[PDB]
Amino acid sequence: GKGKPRGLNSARKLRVHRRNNRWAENNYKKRLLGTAFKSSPFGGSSHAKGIVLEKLGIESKQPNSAIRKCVRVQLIKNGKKVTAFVPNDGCLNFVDENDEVLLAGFGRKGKAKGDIPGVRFKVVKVSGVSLLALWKEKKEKPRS
Amino acid sequence: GRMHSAGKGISSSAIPYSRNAPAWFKLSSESVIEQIVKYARKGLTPSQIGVLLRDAHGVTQARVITGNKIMRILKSNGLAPEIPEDLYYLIKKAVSVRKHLERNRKDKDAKFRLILIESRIHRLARYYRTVAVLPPNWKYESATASALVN
Amino acid sequence: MENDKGQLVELYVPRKCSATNRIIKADDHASVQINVAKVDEEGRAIPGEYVTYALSGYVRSRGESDDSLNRLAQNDGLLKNVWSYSR
Amino acid sequence: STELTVQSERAFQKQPHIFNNPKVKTSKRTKRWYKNAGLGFKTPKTAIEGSYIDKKCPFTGLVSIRGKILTGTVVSTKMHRTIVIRRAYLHYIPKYNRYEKRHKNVPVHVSPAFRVQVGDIVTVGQCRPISKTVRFNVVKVSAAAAKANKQFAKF
Amino acid sequence: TRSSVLADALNAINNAEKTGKRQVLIRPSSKVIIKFLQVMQKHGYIGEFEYIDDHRSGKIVVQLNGRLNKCGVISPRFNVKIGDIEKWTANLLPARQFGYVILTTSAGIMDHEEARRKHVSGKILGFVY
Amino acid sequence: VLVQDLLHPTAASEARKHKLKTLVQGPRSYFLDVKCPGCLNITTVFSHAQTAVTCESCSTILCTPTGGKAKLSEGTSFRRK
RNA sequence: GGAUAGUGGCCUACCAUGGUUUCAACGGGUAACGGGGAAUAAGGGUUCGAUUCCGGAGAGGGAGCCUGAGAAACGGCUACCA
RNA sequence: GCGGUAAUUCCAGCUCCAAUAGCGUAUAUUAAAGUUGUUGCAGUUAAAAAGCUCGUAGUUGAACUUUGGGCCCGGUUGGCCGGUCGGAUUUCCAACGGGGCCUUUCCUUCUGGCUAACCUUGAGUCCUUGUGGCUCUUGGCGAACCAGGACUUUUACUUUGAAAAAAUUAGAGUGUUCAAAGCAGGCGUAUUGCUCGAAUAUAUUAGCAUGGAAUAAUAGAAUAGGACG
RNA sequence: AGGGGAUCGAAGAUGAUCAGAUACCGUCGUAGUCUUAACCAUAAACUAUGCCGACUAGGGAUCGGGUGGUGUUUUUUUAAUGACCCACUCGGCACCUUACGAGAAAUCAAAGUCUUUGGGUUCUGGGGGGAGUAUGGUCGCAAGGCUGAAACUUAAAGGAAUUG
Ligand SMILES: [Mg+2]
Ligand SMILES: [Mg+2]
Ligand SMILES: [Mg+2]
Ligand SMILES: [Mg+2]
Ligand SMILES: [Mg+2]
Ligand SMILES: [Mg+2]
Ligand SMILES: [Mg+2]
Ligand SMILES: [Mg+2]
Ligand SMILES: [Mg+2]
Ligand SMILES: [Mg+2]
Ligand SMILES: [Mg+2]
Ligand SMILES: [Mg+2]
Ligand SMILES: [Mg+2]
Ligand SMILES: [Mg+2]
Ligand SMILES: [Mg+2]
Ligand SMILES: [Mg+2]
Ligand SMILES: [Mg+2]
Ligand SMILES: [Mg+2]
Ligand SMILES: [Mg+2]
Ligand SMILES: [Mg+2]
Ligand SMILES: [Mg+2]
Ligand SMILES: [Mg+2]
Ligand SMILES: [Mg+2]
Ligand SMILES: [Mg+2]
Ligand SMILES: [Mg+2]
Ligand SMILES: [Mg+2]
Ligand SMILES: [Mg+2]
Ligand SMILES: [Mg+2]
Ligand SMILES: [Mg+2]
Ligand SMILES: [Mg+2]
Ligand SMILES: [Mg+2]
Ligand SMILES: [Mg+2]
Ligand SMILES: [Mg+2]
Ligand SMILES: [Mg+2]
Ligand SMILES: [Mg+2]
Ligand SMILES: [Mg+2]
Ligand SMILES: [Mg+2]
Ligand SMILES: [Mg+2]
Ligand SMILES: [Mg+2]
Ligand SMILES: [Mg+2]
Ligand SMILES: [Mg+2]
Ligand SMILES: [Mg+2]
Ligand SMILES: [Zn+2]
């Protein structure tokens, strides 16, 4: 009756087979190959702090017409160069080149967000403070 | 169902329920056993013998009028061959196929058949080998078999 | 299907096929219950007084309704020959 | 293993402190010592009748059997005076609720009191380390020959 | 080639029952089939059966009522640890108030309830309900 | 069909089944005593044969084999059992 | 035989050719110290355990050794490397 | 998916919702996932049966060998009484389990040591007309296990138990004011003290130890180099 | 690598067609097509359905085998043969009808006997692209065969049926 062995001694084949096939799991493979630590701009860690190289004006994908304000960031522990979105209305006004920023993921498991092409990170903080506070008014940008 | 093809074909002797008798059969174990020897005394196979006894004589099953299987009778009188009968005819067959192949190398059908025949030969030997009727490390070889059957 | 203390619980104890003893459920609108009338001396057929049988929609779909009935009524007494238990 | 010679080493092979006084004329040339290993293992007669030396012999030598008792099935008798048995064993795996065949080879000493061949089932008894790999010493043969003589010529 | 001679005798039964029949002929019988057949009968799930004796392995004619929904066999005879008899009846019986796991213990081929009362366990043949 | 006696099948519908599919299986071959009045003695032949069976003393032929039942030779005679 | 607290290719002489492996040896990887345990709740599982307790290892890296019942010790010495 | 002029998604006001001393975001894992499937997937056409056959390792592999009948022994629940000052035991009763006998039936085997149990009985009998009842020694039970000799076909499975750290976990007891915890505490003559605790469970593979004899393997006597004495 | 080389005919060349026409149609015709001795190992190599075993439902055809009949026909003197007709039975290639049953359906005597989930065993798949690509190994004279990733990208791609 189709498939798999049934027998009482066929434990090994049953484990091996599973082992072999577990590899078709997209997440398992990433874990065991250590893809994270190897590819992927962050270490495999949740956030990464980097430095702002240029400010970009990414044009959004269809069916959306817009200009998504972004930044090129060179992760400090890394040299890895990355582009990141600057969330909310204005906020790009807060950043400036050579400034220090804190990058996070986009909540999509790698993968880019919406109509923003090739962007897999967003900012979060600048010069030690946080976009959110700045955008509101709770905090002010530091001197230099 | 069928070892080396996909034939199904259920087809055999349907042996009688009555394990003894036939009771219209006179004669005696005494008698047909002598008649078993004198036949395999002339050189015939045990199966050859049972046929010859079944048709011309009253021997319905040799195993019944006599207490034992024909081959065992043969053994007991020391008439058993070097190797089992079924094995012999397998070997003897592979000899004839090989001969025909050495003469017709373009005959891939024969080559395929040779494989089959030999694979039955070897699996059978491994059974015999297992149950001590052939020596441990007995073995079928093309080179030596042609000599072996005759 | 009784309860804690002897009391009968759970409505409706269903009919069954006289032939298979499977439950005959509500939506089984293909099942059938034959009423066969008892008769008295000089052929009178006694109204409202039956020997009765019930056959599941299953059995009838499978075409076994006639043969099944044959047996049933006969080893009860309404038939004499017709059905054989051997084949 | 041994066989023949017995006095075939560079050092003279002898049982320690088992003196035979040359002054006292004896009728058996050499006084021989043995014990019984205990656990109701019969010290076989070839151990006493024998003249082999083996200081790793359970019955005539300076080892003791203590610890484990193992019965394996002998898979190699190429090393002089030691064998390798395959311990026959079988092993459970919970997730699948079935088992899987496993084996372990064990090296064991074998006194010239025993005459083992490949295929024999053999009961071994633990002893002190005896060599780099051997922690076991034969002690008893549960087999014989495994139907060898029952394979001779034709009728 | 036949692996479980039991499996055939169970299946064959189920099919007859489903096709609405009243009797099966099964082949080739065994000690085990009989005893399994015997348990089913002790609890009503079949009627009378009969061993006809070919001089071979046997045939059986079972006469079944209709109170049988399923009689299955557990393909590997898994060992069961008396603690885990529970877990089995759960996986594959309709309710806790009827139906049986029937298994093979050192103390005879018995339904799990008898097995509990006698305090033995073992490997597991099929089941009935 | 649906209910019947597997245990006591009718001889006719039993007679027509295959030789391995009857209730208990058995052969439907038979033996006979065969004689050609040249001699005074009878020899026993199997309904099927494979071997062309010669009589007691006379080189004669009694039957030639076929694909099943042996064809008895020319002018003879027989009796089953 | 030597060495050791002591068994042992531990080491040395002589002699032999063995030992392991698809029941996966041998090799590679491990962002690997092991365990008690942790998380997740039908069940079967899956993932985790540097880290309060047990065991092991280490004291920038290697090796060597003095003292001593006990260390191949580093809040001991000695040399080399950084 | 909204946003290209009346935007139910943007920027705000108002109002409203959800969780609330807390609530969002990122990354990882777990449940959802029967999308890793032993339980428990799917493979004609959705992803997927090697072009075909042989074949080793591996997995798997028909049936059959003490079954049926008879007799005792003593248990643990439950019914109907309760005798008795909530629970009690005899007999009436079924039911479910344990042991041991006899049936053609090794229980390893001799050589004593042991005897608890009757075929015994030696007297008789507390007492319901008595096989209802046990003390009681001189003919007649082995196995219950001591210990010495002589020998023992191999396993798997299952049972019960031993050996076993604490903390964690499950969980009992106890009013930390509650509670997470803690393992305390509780009574009086609170003026010379009385006292309950500090459980239990789990602890699985392997090794040990005991019972079982179904299921599944191993081995046995055929050139008899067979078996008993 | 030899032989063969009638035919049809990758390539090439041409006549036309066309906006173009490297084509479709027409002509010439190299390789090839055939054969020997060696290679190669792939096809929608298909029933897009692994093998052994059991069970479950009706029907008429047909191929092979066998058994039965005071069947038909062949004439001779009746047989014996032979071909044919009827019944049955194993084993084939298939079709028909139903569907208890299965399926997302189309359909399916297996694709049934499955949440009432275990007869034995082999093999493959785990969203779509990236891609049967890169890389290493191995086979091959070559062409290429086998084995065979990831980064990155993406919300679908896909199946069956329905109405337009
Ligand atoms: Mg893949
Ligand atoms: Mg740039
Ligand atoms: Mg660094
Ligand atoms: Mg068949
Ligand atoms: Mg095959
Ligand atoms: Mg045949
Ligand atoms: Mg050597
Ligand atoms: Mg040495
Ligand atoms: Mg040297
Ligand atoms: Mg060497
Ligand atoms: Mg492997
Ligand atoms: Mg590490
Ligand atoms: Mg740790
Ligand atoms: Mg770990
Ligand atoms: Mg670390
Ligand atoms: Mg240290
Ligand atoms: Mg440091
Ligand atoms: Mg170093
Ligand atoms: Mg140091
Ligand atoms: Mg220190
Ligand atoms: Mg407006
Ligand atoms: Mg508005
Ligand atoms: Mg708003
Ligand atoms: Mg929340
Ligand atoms: Mg399971
Ligand atoms: Mg799926
Ligand atoms: Mg496909
Ligand atoms: Mg295929
Ligand atoms: Mg292959
Ligand atoms: Mg079996
Ligand atoms: Mg336990
Ligand atoms: Mg505790
Ligand atoms: Mg040409
Ligand atoms: Mg051209
Ligand atoms: Mg042109
Ligand atoms: Mg061109
Ligand atoms: Mg292909
Ligand atoms: Mg096709
Ligand atoms: Mg049909
Ligand atoms: Mg005919
Ligand atoms: Mg879209
Ligand atoms: Mg359409
Ligand atoms: Zn004649």
UniProtKB/Swiss-Prot annotation, chain B:
Its main location: cytoplasm. It comes from the Eukaryota. The modification Phosphoserine is found at residue 31. GO terms for cellular component: 90S preribosome; cytoplasm; cytosol; cytosolic small ribosomal subunit; nucleolus. Disulfide bonds: none annotated. Keywords: Cytoplasm, Isopeptide bond, Phosphoprotein, Ribonucleoprotein, Ribosomal protein, Ubl conjugation. Gene3D superfamilies: 4.10.860.130, S15/NS1, RNA-binding (1.10.287.10). Pfam families: Ribosomal_S13_N, Ribosomal_S15. It is found in: Cytoplasm. GO terms for molecular function: small ribosomal subunit rRNA binding; structural constituent of ribosome. There is a cross-link at residues 38, 42 (Glycyl lysine isopeptide (Lys-Gly) (interchain with G-Cter in ubiquitin)). InterPro entries: Ribosomal_uS15, Ribosomal_uS15_arc_euk, Ribosomal_uS15_N, uS15_NS1_RNA-bd_sf. One of its GO terms (biological process) is maturation of SSU-rRNA from tricistronic rRNA transcript (SSU-rRNA, 5.8S rRNA, LSU-rRNA). Component of the ribosome, a large ribonucleoprotein complex responsible for the synthesis of proteins in the cell. The small ribosomal subunit (SSU) binds messenger RNAs (mRNAs) and translates the encoded message by selecting cognate aminoacyl-transfer RNA (tRNA) molecules. The large subunit (LSU) contains the ribosomal catalytic site termed the peptidyl transferase center (PTC), which catalyzes the formation of peptide bonds, thereby polymerizing the amino acids delivered by tRNAs into a polypeptide chain. HAMAP family: Ribosomal_uS15_A. Belongs to the universal ribosomal protein uS15 family. This is Small ribosomal subunit protein uS15. It comes from Saccharomyces cerevisiae (strain ATCC 204508 / S288c).
From Swiss-Prot, chain C:
Disulfide bonds: none annotated. One of its GO terms (molecular function) is structural constituent of ribosome. One of its GO terms (biological process) is endonucleolytic cleavage in ITS1 to separate SSU-rRNA from 5.8S rRNA and LSU-rRNA from tricistronic rRNA transcript (SSU-rRNA, 5.8S rRNA, LSU-rRNA). N-terminally acetylated by acetyltransferase NatB. Disruption phenotype: Reduction in growth rate, a decrease in free 40S subunits, an increase in the amount of free 60S subunits and a decrease in polysome size. It is found in: Cytoplasm. InterPro entries: Ribosomal_eS21 (IPR001931), Ribosomal_eS21_CS (IPR018279), Ribosomal_eS21_sf (IPR038579). Transmembrane segments: none annotated. The keyword Acetylation applies. GO terms for cellular component: cytosol; cytosolic small ribosomal subunit. Its main location: cytoplasm. The modification N-acetylmethionine is found at residue 1. Keywords: Acetylation, Cytoplasm, Ribonucleoprotein, Ribosomal protein, rRNA processing. Component of the ribosome, a large ribonucleoprotein complex responsible for the synthesis of proteins in the cell. The small ribosomal subunit (SSU) binds messenger RNAs (mRNAs) and translates the encoded message by selecting cognate aminoacyl-transfer RNA (tRNA) molecules. The large subunit (LSU) contains the ribosomal catalytic site termed the peptidyl transferase center (PTC), which catalyzes the formation of peptide bonds, thereby polymerizing the amino acids delivered by tRNAs into a polypeptide chain. Present with 27400 molecules/cell in log phase SD medium. There are 2 genes for eS21 in yeast. This is Small ribosomal subunit protein eS21A.
From Swiss-Prot, chain D:
GO terms for cellular component: 90S preribosome; cytosol; cytosolic small ribosomal subunit. Pfam families: Ribosomal_S17, Ribosomal_S17_N. The modification N-acetylserine is found at residue 1. CDD domains: Ribosomal_uS17. InterPro entries: NA-bd_OB-fold, Ribosomal_uS17, Ribosomal_uS17_arc/euk, Ribosomal_uS17_CS, Ribosomal_uS17_N. It is found in: Cytoplasm. There is a cross-link at residues 14, 45, 55-56, 78, 95, 104, 132, 140, 147 (Glycyl lysine isopeptide (Lys-Gly) (interchain with G-Cter in ubiquitin)). GO terms for molecular function: rRNA binding; structural constituent of ribosome. Its main location: cytoplasm. GO terms for biological process: maturation of SSU-rRNA from tricistronic rRNA transcript (SSU-rRNA, 5.8S rRNA, LSU-rRNA); ribosomal small subunit assembly; translation. Keywords: Acetylation, Cytoplasm, Isopeptide bond, Ribonucleoprotein, Ribosomal protein, RNA-binding, rRNA-binding, Ubl conjugation. SUPFAM superfamilies: Nucleic acid-binding proteins. PROSITE patterns: RIBOSOMAL_S17. N-terminally acetylated by acetyltransferase NatA. It comes from the Eukaryota. Component of the small ribosomal subunit (SSU). Mature yeast ribosomes consist of a small (40S) and a large (60S) subunit. The 40S small subunit contains 1 molecule of ribosomal RNA (18S rRNA) and 33 different proteins (encoded by 57 genes). The large 60S subunit contains 3 rRNA molecules (25S, 5.8S and 5S rRNA) and 46 different proteins (encoded by 81 genes). There are 2 genes for uS17 in yeast. Belongs to the universal ribosomal protein uS17 family. This is Small ribosomal subunit protein uS17A. The lineage of its organism: Eukaryota, Fungi, Dikarya, Ascomycota, Saccharomycotina.
From Swiss-Prot, chain E:
GO terms for biological process: cytoplasmic translation. One of its GO terms (molecular function) is structural constituent of ribosome. Keywords: Cytoplasm, Ribonucleoprotein, Ribosomal protein. One of its GO terms (cellular component) is cytosol. The keyword Cytoplasm applies. This is Small ribosomal subunit protein uS8A. Component of the small ribosomal subunit (SSU). Mature yeast ribosomes consist of a small (40S) and a large (60S) subunit. The 40S small subunit contains 1 molecule of ribosomal RNA (18S rRNA) and 33 different proteins (encoded by 57 genes). The large 60S subunit contains 3 rRNA molecules (25S, 5.8S and 5S rRNA) and 46 different proteins (encoded by 81 genes). Belongs to the universal ribosomal protein uS8 family. The gene is RPS22A. Component of the ribosome, a large ribonucleoprotein complex responsible for the synthesis of proteins in the cell. The small ribosomal subunit (SSU) binds messenger RNAs (mRNAs) and translates the encoded message by selecting cognate aminoacyl-transfer RNA (tRNA) molecules. The large subunit (LSU) contains the ribosomal catalytic site termed the peptidyl transferase center (PTC), which catalyzes the formation of peptide bonds, thereby polymerizing the amino acids delivered by tRNAs into a polypeptide chain. The keyword Cytoplasm applies. It comes from Saccharomyces cerevisiae (strain ATCC 204508 / S288c).
